Amino acid sequence: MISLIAALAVDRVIGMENAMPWNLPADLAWFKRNTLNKPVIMGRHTWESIGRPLPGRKNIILSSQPGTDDRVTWVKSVDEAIAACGDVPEIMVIGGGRVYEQFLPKAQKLYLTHIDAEVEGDTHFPDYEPDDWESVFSEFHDADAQNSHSYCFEILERR
Ligand SMILES: Nc1cccc(Cn2ccc3c4c(N)nc(N)nc4ccc32)c1
C-alpha cells in the first residue's frame, strides 16, 4: 500500500535542502525509521537533494528524463513506479511536490512532520480534504539545541 511522507512548514509549505528549516535532526531520524527497508519513490529534484541512494531501500526515481545513475531505478510513470516496487506491504513516496500530487489519490496513509516555522516557498503539500483523512497519531516536540524549531509528527489514514 502507498504512503506519503513529508516535512511541512506553516501553510503546508514544503521544500528540500540541507538547510533551514527541513534539516532538523529529529525529523531526519523519523524519516529514516519510517522508510527503512521499504521502497522509496521520489522526484528528480528530491533525488539530487540526497545525492546518494538510501541504503537498504530500493530507490525509484520518477522523471520524464532519462537516468544518470545506475545505482537507482528510473521510470516515467506512476504505474511503472509502483510496479518497480514489487509485492511489498508499504511503498514510501518521499517527495517532491509534483510527486505528492500524483500519488495522493492512491495513498492510504500520510506521515506528516509539522514544523512550527515559516519559510517562503511557492511549493506546497497537496490539500487533503480532512473529511477523507483521519488522524490516528500525533507527537509534539519542543525546540532544543539540535532542533531549532518545535515540530509535530502526525500519521493520518484514508477514510
Ligand atoms: N541527507 C539526506 C538523507 C535523507 C533524506 C534527505 C533529503 N530528504 C528527502 C526527503 C526528505 C524528507 C521527507 N520526505 N519527509 C520528511 N518528513 N523528512 C524528510 C527529510 C529529508 C528528506 C537528505
PDB file of N, CA and C in Angstrom, residues 42-54 59 61 68-69 71-72 74:
ATOM      1  N   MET A  42      10.532   8.839  -5.580  1.00  0.00           N
ATOM      2  CA  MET A  42      10.857  10.249  -5.442  1.00  0.00           C
ATOM      3  C   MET A  42      11.014  10.931  -6.797  1.00  0.00           C
ATOM      4  N   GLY A  43      10.858  12.250  -6.791  1.00  0.00           N
ATOM      5  CA  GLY A  43      11.110  13.066  -7.965  1.00  0.00           C
ATOM      6  C   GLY A  43      12.598  13.281  -8.189  1.00  0.00           C
ATOM      7  N   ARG A  44      12.940  13.931  -9.298  1.00  0.00           N
ATOM      8  CA  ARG A  44      14.340  14.123  -9.661  1.00  0.00           C
ATOM      9  C   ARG A  44      15.035  15.133  -8.730  1.00  0.00           C
ATOM     10  N   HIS A  45      14.348  16.222  -8.394  1.00  0.00           N
ATOM     11  CA  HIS A  45      14.920  17.241  -7.510  1.00  0.00           C
ATOM     12  C   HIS A  45      15.180  16.670  -6.114  1.00  0.00           C
ATOM     13  N   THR A  46      14.290  15.803  -5.647  1.00  0.00           N
ATOM     14  CA  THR A  46      14.476  15.145  -4.365  1.00  0.00           C
ATOM     15  C   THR A  46      15.645  14.161  -4.419  1.00  0.00           C
ATOM     16  N   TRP A  47      15.861  13.554  -5.580  1.00  0.00           N
ATOM     17  CA  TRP A  47      16.961  12.609  -5.758  1.00  0.00           C
ATOM     18  C   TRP A  47      18.310  13.321  -5.707  1.00  0.00           C
ATOM     19  N   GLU A  48      18.372  14.473  -6.360  1.00  0.00           N
ATOM     20  CA  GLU A  48      19.552  15.316  -6.320  1.00  0.00           C
ATOM     21  C   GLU A  48      19.755  15.832  -4.893  1.00  0.00           C
ATOM     22  N   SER A  49      18.653  16.145  -4.215  1.00  0.00           N
ATOM     23  CA  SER A  49      18.681  16.672  -2.841  1.00  0.00           C
ATOM     24  C   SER A  49      19.315  15.718  -1.823  1.00  0.00           C
ATOM     25  N   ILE A  50      19.500  14.462  -2.213  1.00  0.00           N
ATOM     26  CA  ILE A  50      20.114  13.444  -1.359  1.00  0.00           C
ATOM     27  C   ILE A  50      21.499  13.048  -1.877  1.00  0.00           C
ATOM     28  N   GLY A  51      21.691  13.195  -3.188  1.00  0.00           N
ATOM     29  CA  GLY A  51      22.956  12.915  -3.854  1.00  0.00           C
ATOM     30  C   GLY A  51      23.494  11.502  -3.707  1.00  0.00           C
ATOM     31  N   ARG A  52      22.667  10.603  -3.189  1.00  0.00           N
ATOM     32  CA  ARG A  52      23.119   9.263  -2.849  1.00  0.00           C
ATOM     33  C   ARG A  52      21.910   8.384  -2.581  1.00  0.00           C
ATOM     34  N   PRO A  53      21.925   7.137  -3.079  1.00  0.00           N
ATOM     35  CA  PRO A  53      20.761   6.300  -2.781  1.00  0.00           C
ATOM     36  C   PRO A  53      20.631   6.029  -1.280  1.00  0.00           C
ATOM     37  N   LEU A  54      19.400   5.855  -0.815  1.00  0.00           N
ATOM     38  CA  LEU A  54      19.144   5.475   0.563  1.00  0.00           C
ATOM     39  C   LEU A  54      19.455   3.991   0.756  1.00  0.00           C
ATOM     40  N   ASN A  59      15.518   2.361  -4.409  1.00  0.00           N
ATOM     41  CA  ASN A  59      15.281   3.761  -4.763  1.00  0.00           C
ATOM     42  C   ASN A  59      14.705   3.859  -6.166  1.00  0.00           C
ATOM     43  N   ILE A  61      13.195   6.574  -9.018  1.00  0.00           N
ATOM     44  CA  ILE A  61      13.103   7.967  -9.448  1.00  0.00           C
ATOM     45  C   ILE A  61      12.115   8.186 -10.594  1.00  0.00           C
ATOM     46  N   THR A  68      20.651   9.032 -14.906  1.00  0.00           N
ATOM     47  CA  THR A  68      22.063   9.392 -14.912  1.00  0.00           C
ATOM     48  C   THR A  68      22.788   8.693 -13.777  1.00  0.00           C
ATOM     49  N   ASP A  69      22.144   7.678 -13.206  1.00  0.00           N
ATOM     50  CA  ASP A  69      22.718   6.917 -12.102  1.00  0.00           C
ATOM     51  C   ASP A  69      22.140   5.501 -12.082  1.00  0.00           C
ATOM     52  N   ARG A  71      22.701   3.159  -9.893  1.00  0.00           N
ATOM     53  CA  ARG A  71      22.507   2.644  -8.535  1.00  0.00           C
ATOM     54  C   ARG A  71      21.031   2.678  -8.131  1.00  0.00           C
ATOM     55  N   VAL A  72      20.214   3.304  -8.973  1.00  0.00           N
ATOM     56  CA  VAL A  72      18.801   3.504  -8.682  1.00  0.00           C
ATOM     57  C   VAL A  72      17.971   3.179  -9.922  1.00  0.00           C
ATOM     58  N   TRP A  74      15.107   4.175 -12.626  1.00  0.00           N
ATOM     59  CA  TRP A  74      14.427   5.310 -13.257  1.00  0.00           C
ATOM     60  C   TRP A  74      13.177   4.870 -14.046  1.00  0.00           C
TER      61      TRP A  74
END
